[PDB]
Symmetry: D2
Subunit: 113 residues, 4 copies
């Protein structure tokens, strides 16, 4: 498990907020950021559609150009962000309560490396 920390937007309540979080990897020098929005899909299921940037560490500023990978992640419950979320890769995460400023913490387990 690595800790995650982020926020969900609080501007309107007329939609399901966008959100972003950072996973602060505890087994490597990398960081990953996720950003997305929660939807009620056509079948009634909550879905988090996110995209992510995975930042690797480099030792030389001249290698900076190759340090960022990008991709998607769709999470389904195991539209409050709070709870447990799973993915098809087998990765999963837990999000705690969202407070009045829209902040939340959680934990992330990656099935893949």
């Amino acid at each position: 498990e690595s800790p995650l920390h982020g926020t969900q937007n609080t501007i309107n309540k007329r939609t399901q907020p966008t959100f972003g979080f950072t996973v602060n990897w505890k087994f490597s020098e990398s960081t990953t950021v996720f950003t997305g929005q929660c939807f009620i899909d056509r079948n009634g299921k909550e879905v988090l559609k996110t995209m992510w940037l995975l930042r690797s560490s480099v030792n030389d500023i001249g290698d900076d150009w190759k340090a960022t990978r990008v991709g998607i992640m769709i999470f389904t419950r195991l539209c409050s962000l709070t709870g447990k979320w799973t993915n098809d890769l087998g990765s999963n995460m837990t999000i705690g309560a969202v407070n009045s400023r829209g902040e939340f913490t959680g934990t992330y387990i990656t099935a893949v490396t």
Copy 2:
């Protein structure tokens, strides 16, 4: 100003940590996340970002995310940073676990 919340990687040394943060925009319903690395030789943050727009329908999700880069100049994340879009950021003390908060001002929309 909009609040940012992130974490700096604390694994091993490292003189030049990676990091990530999320800016929760206070004038828009979107969210941006930045990730990158703090270099020192003079400190510079080289980041890439994803700007997530809010969409009304799950049908529109495909077009909701823009991407780009941002270099900030005046390795610790703590303190004041600027860039050449004219955007400014202030970052507070970093925790032993690596968590930080701050504020972000964007010069462009």
Copy 3:
């Protein structure tokens, strides 16, 4: 439901054991935009050939000051409606036809997007 647009690309391989990577550009005929797609063909759990791609959609901006916001990113998985040649479809409803691939790896085709 859109106008068909041309696409042009190349595939790249050395070791026959892995399927080639490829990229292509779609030259949109109803907009000022350009999209590039890159990815690789796999055989699904299923059966099935799948093109797993990611894309960058470049909008036209008038002012270089607005360059920062001109690029969208996402994924697209295509399945036949592991050769690139033939007809491919996706979850949005978008459709793609790719012609024969030449000895240089070059290929062309047509793209119809069901979304804008």
Copy 4:
């Protein structure tokens, strides 16, 4: 030195057109795609502002998630045709652009 080709969009006859190209790397199995726009900058210089996706060949559909890198590339010496260079030390030359927006060129990468 590696081959590229792509197309420029001329749907509005823009003096600052968008474009994209594929670079077919010759001594690897990777593919990079670039997309951007040609600008006349504030100081009169031509500048290509682009972003790229670099795709690695992976062995297994299960590693597909880690196969794509992203970043920017700004080229300076608005026509695409000619010689262009960047901060990394890389060099590109673009051929003639035909009536349909199509061009080919070569890309000498300085980094890997």
